[PDB]
Amino acid sequence: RQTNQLQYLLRVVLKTLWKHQFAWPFQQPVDAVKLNLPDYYKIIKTPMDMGTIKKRLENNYYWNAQECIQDFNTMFTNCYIYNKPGDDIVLMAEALEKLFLQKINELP
Ligand SMILES: COc1cc2c(cc1-c1c(C)noc1C)[nH]c1nc(C)nc(Nc3cc(C4CC4)nn3C)c12
Structure with missing residues (x-):
């Protein structure tokens, strides 16, 4: 059977990453005002998160x-730009990225 890659990204990749123990800080935009990070939007020009990716997949944005x-x-x-090598959020992001690349490599 053929594989619809965008449906794979939503139903397999996003679903797998979403359930990961480190996923929750990445499930919605970084709320920099609430997190007391006033320089966040100075350093990060194009914010991105899994909640936004999920909405774009659902709304046929791509x-x-x-x-x-x-x-x-x-x-x-x-995450790697804003934070520093070795920070907890960076370790969390690195783990999720390795899983993400594994899931893309698994595309049937
Ligand atoms: C420390 O970076 C974050 C924390 C939270 C987050 C996003 C980020 C973030 C940054 C900055 N750059 O990329 C990402 C991704 N969203 C949250 N939502 C809530 C309610 N609390 C948060 N508390 C939180 C989580 C963490 C984990 C150990 C690293 N530590 N702390 C302070 C974060």
Whole structure:
């Protein structure tokens, strides 16, 4: 059978990452005012999170699977930009990114 890559990203990849123990800080936009991070939007030009990716997948926002993959990568790299090598959130992001690349590699 054929695989619809955007449906794979929603039903397999996003669903797998969503259930991970480290997923919750990434399930919605970084609320920088509530988290007392007033420079967040100075450093992070294109915020991204899994709640936004889920909504874009559901609303047929993406042209193709690659545009969706680009948003997962922006979410991970924003974390690496704002924070420092070795910080807890970076460790959490690295673990989720490794799982994300595993799931993309598993595409049937
Ligand atoms: C420390 O970075 C975050 C924390 C929270 C978050 C997003 C981020 C975040 C940043 C900054 N850059 O990319 C991401 C991703 N969203 C939350 N929502 C709530 C209600 N509480 C939070 N508390 C939280 C979680 C963590 C974990 C150990 C790293 N530590 N603390 C202070 C965060």
